[PDB]
Amino acid sequence: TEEQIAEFKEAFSLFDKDGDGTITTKELGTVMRSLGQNPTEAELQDMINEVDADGNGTIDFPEFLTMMARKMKDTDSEEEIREAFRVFDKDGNGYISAAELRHVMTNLGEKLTDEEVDEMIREADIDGDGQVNYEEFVQ
Amino acid sequence: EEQIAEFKEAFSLFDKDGDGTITTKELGTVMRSLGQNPTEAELQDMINEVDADGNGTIDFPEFLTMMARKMKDTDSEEEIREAFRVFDKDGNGYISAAELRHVMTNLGEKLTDEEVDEMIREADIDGDGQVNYEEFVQMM
Ligand SMILES: [Ca+2]
Ligand SMILES: [Ca+2]
Ligand SMILES: [Ca+2]
Ligand SMILES: [Ca+2]
Ligand SMILES: [Zn+2]
Ligand SMILES: [Zn+2]
Ligand SMILES: [Zn+2]
Ligand SMILES: [Zn+2]
Ligand SMILES: [Zn+2]
Ligand SMILES: [Zn+2]
């Protein structure tokens, strides 16, 4: 456990009174109340929306992690996209090359022709440089 | 950091014609330049241990495998595990449904609770409701 997952798993399961894997405004409100806080039904749905990546109005364990990390959903989202980008950028120079895309896609089970790889890099290459950078990846 | 600049320096030495790939011909020239007379078979062999895409020649990412001391199967397994780690947000060794949904969404694939639960279904071989590493390797 990191800056403790185990503790966050503890916390989450306190909040998630009914064990359904999500924390509602209802359940969130009960806990805040127990600590002598009086949030409104809007303050609560706001607390949830800060982290509600799948937009369902409720907090699942992953999104709960965002909360615990202090982050908003947009920031958490950007960390995850970067971890993805890093899987492809094997040499870590900030750009995915055609060879890297082909190499890693193949290693992840998706064998692509030199045709399909060159096309995928074409499409995403906005800077015009023959390589896919982080901002370019983000689409 | 310095490792990669020197690996990049090395690759360009080998890849005399700036191709972006290293052939048995080019590989053989450098070995010849130093101590050895490898056979065509020995060279094709050297390449085959890192040729992930099977095209018979060494590109730069495959060249990194060599320089990491690895074979292609080992390199491949590390890259899968890095992928698995993107999904396993809490790092306990299992991709939950909530995790798959959460990370797919954040990578620009919004899936229904329906499709996520199906995806975990199909890859979940031991029936525990979660996708472990070996199960992930199978799904890919
Ligand atoms: Ca609940
Ligand atoms: Ca570019
Ligand atoms: Ca190759
Ligand atoms: Ca997990
Ligand atoms: Zn949610
Ligand atoms: Zn997240
Ligand atoms: Zn790169
Ligand atoms: Zn060449
Ligand atoms: Zn590799
Ligand atoms: Zn399983």
Author numbering:
A (entry chain A): 6 to 144
B (entry chain B): 7 to 146
Tell me what the authors wrote about this structure, in their words:
CaM consists of two homologous (46% sequence identity) globular lobes; each has a pair of Ca2+ binding sites (EF-hand motifs), connected by a flexible linker. In apo CaM (Ca2+ free), the α-helices in the EF-hand motifs are positioned almost parallel to each other (closed conformation), whereas in the presence of Ca2+, the α-helices of the EF-hand motifs change their position relative to each other, forming an almost perpendicular conformation (open conformation).
In the present study, the IQ peptides derived from Nm and Ng were present in the crystallization drops; however, no electron density was observed to confirm the existence of complex in the crystal. This crystal structure of CaM, in which no substrate peptide was bound (hereafter referred as ligand-free CaM), adopts a unique trans conformation that has so far not been observed. There are two identical molecules (RMSD 0.7 Å) in the asymmetric unit. However, the PISA server analysis and gel filtration chromatography suggest that ligand-free CaM is a monomer. The CaM molecule adopts an extended dumbbell-shaped conformation and the two domains are well separated. Thus, the present conformational change observed in the central helix of the CaM is independent of the bound metal ions.
